[PDB]
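Lab notebook, page 48
Experiment: co-folding of the full assembly
Goal: obtain a model of how the components sit together before planning crosslinking
Operator: M.T.
Materials (sequences as entered):
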Amino acid sequence: MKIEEGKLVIWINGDKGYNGLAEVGKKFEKDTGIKVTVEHPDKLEEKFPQVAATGDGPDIIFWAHDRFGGYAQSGLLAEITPAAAFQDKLYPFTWDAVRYNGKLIAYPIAVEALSLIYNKDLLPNPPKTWEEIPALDKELKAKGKSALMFNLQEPYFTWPLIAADGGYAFKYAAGKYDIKDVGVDNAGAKAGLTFLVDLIKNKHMNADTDYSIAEAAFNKGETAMTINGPWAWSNIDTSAVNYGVTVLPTFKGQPSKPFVGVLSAGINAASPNKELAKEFLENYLLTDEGLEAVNKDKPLGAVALKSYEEELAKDPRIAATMENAQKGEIMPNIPQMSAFWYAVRTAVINAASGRQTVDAALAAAQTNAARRKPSWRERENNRRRERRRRAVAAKIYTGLRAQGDYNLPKHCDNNEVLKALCVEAGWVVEEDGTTYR
Amino acid sequence: MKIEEGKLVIWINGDKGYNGLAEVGKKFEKDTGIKVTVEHPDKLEEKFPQVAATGDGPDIIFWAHDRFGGYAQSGLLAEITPAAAFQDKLYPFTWDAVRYNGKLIAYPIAVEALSLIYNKDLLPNPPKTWEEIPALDKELKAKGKSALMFNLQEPYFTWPLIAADGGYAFKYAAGKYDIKDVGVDNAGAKAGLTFLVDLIKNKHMNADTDYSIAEAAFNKGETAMTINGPWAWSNIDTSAVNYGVTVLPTFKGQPSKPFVGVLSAGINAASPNKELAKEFLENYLLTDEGLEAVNKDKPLGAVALKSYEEELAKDPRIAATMENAQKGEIMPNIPQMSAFWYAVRTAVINAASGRQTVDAALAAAQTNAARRKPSWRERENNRRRERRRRAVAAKIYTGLRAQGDYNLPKHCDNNEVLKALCVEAGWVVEEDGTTYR
DNA sequence: TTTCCACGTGGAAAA
DNA sequence: TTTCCACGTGGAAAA
Ligand SMILES: OC[C@H]1O[C@H](O[C@H]2[C@H](O)[C@@H](O)[C@@H](O)O[C@@H]2CO)[C@H](O)[C@@H](O)[C@@H]1O
Ligand SMILES: OC[C@H]1O[C@H](O[C@H]2[C@H](O)[C@@H](O)[C@@H](O)O[C@@H]2CO)[C@H](O)[C@@H](O)[C@@H]1O
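Observation: model returned without errors.
Model output:
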């Protein structure tokens, strides 16, 4: 698709309040006449870098801030230049999340952190430690239920446990992240992933559990706990479950440390509606009424807008979210975050499935998250080099065929021409290529 | 995931009533103590052949019958052995849909056909032809609306128009489908796809419109019509839209001819719960109460079970469905269907985007749908031939480097060894490989 | 049907 | 860092 003047197209993930956001787009059209289409395609965080490089993609893209550094490095995002008056409306630290190489590259929307969600009727007193969950499961299994179910296919949901005892993504020192100092293979990370794997080995969780499976099981009252973010609360409200949101359990005495995301809205550098996108975001979405429309559809978490966050912070579910967020850390936005996430995803899935050990899975994850992606020019240099090597060889064999006068079959490969060249030069070549004088 | 004896795991597509089916599973657990888990993973029709080949995958898999023949050819499905008494409860033609090489390979559940779905308030009199849609759209655009929106990413939705004037998949003659006689490149197919591409060219449709975009636009009252199946009705019910279900419009005076699917349930050949699966399907799902539970969640269409279908056939939406189904054709279940579907999907997406012309898109689709998938042994044969070719060459150069005394640099490639061999034999080799005596 | 070389990226190796 | 051969499948070619 292509962005075209006079219309706005927005990409936001399918677990967010896209219906409420389209409601904001409808008000925008009422007052300005500009149509606003909100779409929630799959794997949008991966599709956007593929289409935007060529000029395609949506006008605005919503994702957590951790992806945006890589979009900016690739030149996919227009610089955001809000007036001071508007910057004053959002918490400074939310702006930090969307600053890359000194420039603001997106509008921050809301702060997200995972919390422990629990069924109060099945479990009036939720566990304070990861360690006690096995025994809690044994007890609930006798009653036909299970202790805990959460998405094991996305490393976002397992990272709090991996980081609890000392695992980290990229080390931060002297005011910067060290791209080559990755902490996914240290004792802390190994202990966290081992406990999770042992949960599966002892049949307290299933390695194939994903987002929809865990959400269905908690919202149907089959499991007593899940791990999820504020966007999930709306579907629980519609269910018959009496749920609480609280601090994640500790592991080895230390708090679980979720990676904290800032839902952010970037403007496609190829869009011809940059000013319209700015007006929509600053003056329609990032208002009390606009964020309310979105929040009422699927809760946003702690919104970047101070005026509305003052209301939302009264909700004890938000206070628990931010308690967890204080114990975690804001995600880096550096372009390498994509490589980190793929590597940890592979490690978690492979260790959960028994395909690899925890030590082997995390060792490979360490090297992969540190691996430098070859540039376009490097790939092209290698492609050309091998093109040239084949062309030189092909020309040699053409000349040997055309002038050798070797006693060759009507059809033969260049190996048979090589053999004849060898005999001419005084060599003997056996059937398997063994060659000697 | 591996099937475990004593529990049932089911895969069904996410647009079906998986919540109603899980209710059937819960009754089954209440009467037999066997846990039933219903899951709706993405791309399950592609995942099943990958996992089931090694004994993995679910106990039961739901999909339209078209996919089943390829599963059976690969040995992924247990043969279905209902007693004659049970078979008599389903319409004979539904059993034919799941018969492959003389054997029953799945239980038929329900007959699905696409219909034209329209908004009565915006469109009291739905169009009877495709030809009048452009004018109708221009009318509705003046009111800020559009005429028609349907999924353009899946060829199932566009096939009725492609088949209207003569396009076909595999020609049927003398009781068999001829897999070398494909009709995606004939005049009728071109005329149908040209009309669709012309709709996009004249801005009556957008090439990137997918399932959720079309469903959202119709269910929010922004487009007057959509093309979809019975599963979609419940979401329209919850919406404010006053809709009708009717015959698809004609093209060039001929009816649109949808490919008719039979939602079918196959039993994994690797399952240790084959008898439980048969009990669940025959005596819990394929009952009035069982199908009712699923149909209440998302309408199944015209169910294979005679007793319950006499109730459902009273519904004017089902009569419309079957009117369209009489105009279309039951899909083949032959293994070549997946290759047919991939080819047409690429052709539709490529012509709708302008990346290929209609003629060029359908010309490639014809050869692709007819292309014989090389066997494992053919691929292996090829792999070994090239492995051997490289190993013969490597042995010759090893012998040359070890015994030639060619005055070579410390590091050089085989081309330089070849060059030294050539001059030894009285040849001249230029820098680019030009070789002469 | 088989056969042959081309293709671009992997990863071992040397520095 | 660059270099070099291996890899398995594509598609042209001959039959
Ligand atoms: O699992 C890796 C994934 O984690 C984060 O994605 C979150 C996202 O921030 C949330 O808004 C919500 O949608 O859940 C997602 C996990 O499925 C990172 O933001 C993302 O880059 C990363 O791939
Ligand atoms: O688009 C190709 C696709 O068509 C059919 O899939 C249908 C399915 O039968 C319906 O039940 C519903 O889910 O819509 C699907 C299209 O998205 C074929 O059954 C399928 O094999 C084929 O790939």
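Interpretation: DSSP finds 18 helices and 17 strands in chain B.
Next step: discuss with group before ordering constructs.
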